[PDB]
């Protein structure tokens, strides 16, 4: 099977500035990475598939980039309902993986 | 508009077997497959299966061949998960999905999901 | 009083029964001939592609060249595609419309047109899709124009097959409009799968995204046909309209029964289902037919007819 690594599980960030959220594929995926967003509330959204195609719906501030096995997604200025867990899944292999997820927090002190 | 209303949560006796459901509204289910990903706090995201409800066709991960079935009924609009054997390590939130886009499988709208508690108590 | 095209929505597509009923119903909106199922589904990959810095050391061999090298690789592709997580059919080999032989006769088309597997036909069938031949070749429009006959005739020509467009969206007059050559990958159905002809347009959507493009294909288009008894430069964008699905209603009236005819296949008695059209886009580069520039550049062993 596919694994899929997310290496920075908690990433700090504050409003307005940008982040970015990186996973890695054990393998070749062939730009097949969607990316899920999980608010604390637990709902699941989809903000990217293929590879950098954003869903209908989704603001302009989500975006995706990347090719082989490494792969990243970025926001342009973070908002306050953004802070949510960030999964990549490969949909390159039939047996679909999920990445670790990432948490985004707000800076402090 | 497209929603996927899945059933209450669940409290059920290790050993016991469980249906979980995933009522469908603004799509009729003969169109996507119906698939059912499985959370934990811990684990991260794990996908278990799918059915062709115009067809009745299943595949599974090789984790949960005898740990789920996905039945679907056209007439209800309604997908059903059934987990057998219950143990502790299937305690978890069961996610209701579906995809439209048959080259990119991107799951595109998901079910509030259903929270599952194994515990003799 | 007789009808000869009929169009039922993609939605819920199933061919009509055979013999179900031995008199159909009298208010029915079918036609009468619309009873069995198709000799084969039509599928067509139309091809639309642009130079976007167009500037003047272009030549009009580019025209044809830039455009054909990436068909080599399309029809590859299409070939090799696979629906990941199907529930029936997985590739192209299951469904497509097998063909064994052209008629005895029609030698001179031999290594021109497929044989022995599936019939799909592309500008590739030329040099046999093999990209080698493609780019050893020294006269493209030469390869392309060399069964060309000199006058009009009833029957379509090789190139209106292999190209599955109108002539005027092909031809060496573009370059003097700065236009590009597009051309039709057609695909030949024996059976319909829904879920696959999804993936591969999908699938060419991902890999090719067309922008503006605002295609309907809400409906298949069933066409019979009746037997016969005589006894600054400012290059154009790459636009979708009305115009570009149902392109088939533009080419010549002999263009599928000269095609079906040659492997042995006749249509006096049945019909056939046109699907809606896949659009694929292009975006090319100067550079790159600049890179790929030949001795023999701008002296072909082939001029327009009656100039
Ligand atoms: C071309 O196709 C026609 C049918 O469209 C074939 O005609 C019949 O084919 C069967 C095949 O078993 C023969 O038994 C009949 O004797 C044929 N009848 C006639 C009137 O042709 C025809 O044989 C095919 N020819 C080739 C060379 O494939």
Request: net charge neutral.
């Amino acid at each position: 099977d596919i694994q899929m690594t997310q290496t920075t599980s908690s990433l700090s960030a504050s409003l307005g500035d940008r982040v970015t959220i990186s996973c890695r594929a054990s393998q070749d995926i062939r730009n097949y990475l969607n990316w899920y967003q999980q608010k604390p509330d637990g709902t699941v959204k989809l903000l990217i598939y293929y590879t950098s195609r954003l869903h209908s719906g989704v603001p302009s501030r989500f975006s995706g980039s990347g090719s082989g096995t490494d792969y990243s997604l970025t926001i342009s200025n973070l908002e306050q309902e953004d802070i949510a867990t960030y999964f990549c899944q490969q949909t390159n292999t039939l047996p679909w993986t999920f990445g670790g997820g990432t948490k985004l927090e707000i800076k402090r002190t | 508009e497209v929603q996927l209303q899945q059933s209450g949560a669940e409290l059920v006796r290790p050993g016991a077997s469980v249906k979980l459901s995933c009522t469908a509204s603004g799509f009729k289910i003969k169109d996507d497959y119906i698939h059912w990903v499985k959370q934990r706090p811990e684990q991260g995201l794990e996908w278990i299966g799918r059915i062709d409800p115009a067809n009745g066709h299943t595949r599974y991960a090789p984790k949960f061949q005898d740990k789920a079935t996905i039945t679907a009924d056209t007439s209800s609009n309604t997908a059903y998960l059934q987990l057998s054997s219950l143990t502790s390590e299937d305690t978890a939130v069961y996610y209701c999905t579906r995809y439209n886009d048959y080259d990119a499988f991107y799951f595109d709208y998901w079910g509030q999901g259903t929270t599952l508690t194994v515990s003799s108590a | 009083t007789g009808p000869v095209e009929f169009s039922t929505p993609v939605k819920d597509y199933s061919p009509p029964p055979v013999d179900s009923d031995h008199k159909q119903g009298e208010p029915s909106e079918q036609p009468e001939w619309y009873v069995g199922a198709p000799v084969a589904y039509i599928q067509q990959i139309f091809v639309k592609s642009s130079v976007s810095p167009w500037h003047k050391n272009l030549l009009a061999v580019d025209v044809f060249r830039l455009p054909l090298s990436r068909a080599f690789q399309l029809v590859e592709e299409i070939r090799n595609h696979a629906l990941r997580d199907s529930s029936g059919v997985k590739s192209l080999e299951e469904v497509c419309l097998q063909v064994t032989d052209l008629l005895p006769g029609l030698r001179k088309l031999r290594n021109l047109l497929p044989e022995h597997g599936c019939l799909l036909l592309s500008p590739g069938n030329f040099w046999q899709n093999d990209w080698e031949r493609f780019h050893a070749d020294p006269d493209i429009i030469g390869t392309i124009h060399q069964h060309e006959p000199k006058t009009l005739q009833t029957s379509a020509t090789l190139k209106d097959l292999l190209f599955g467009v109108p002539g005027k969206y092909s031809g060496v007059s573009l370059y003097t409009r700065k236009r590009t050559v597009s051309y039709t990958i057609t695909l030949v159905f024996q059976r319909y799968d829904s879920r696959f002809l999804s993936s591969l347009r999908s699938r060419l959507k991902l890999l090719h995204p067309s922008p503006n493009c605002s295609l309907r294909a809400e409906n298949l288009v069933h066409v019979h046909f009746k037997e016969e008894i005589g006894i600054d430069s400012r290059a154009p964008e790459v636009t979708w309209g009305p115009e570009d699905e149902e392109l088939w209603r533009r080419l010549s009236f002999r263009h599928w029964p000269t095609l079906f005819n040659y492997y042995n296949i006749t249509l006096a008695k049945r019909y056939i289902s046109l699907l809606p059209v896949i659009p694929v886009t292009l975006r090319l580069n100067p550079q790159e037919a600049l890179e790929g520039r030949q001795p023999q550049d701008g002296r072909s062993a082939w001029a327009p007819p009656e100039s």
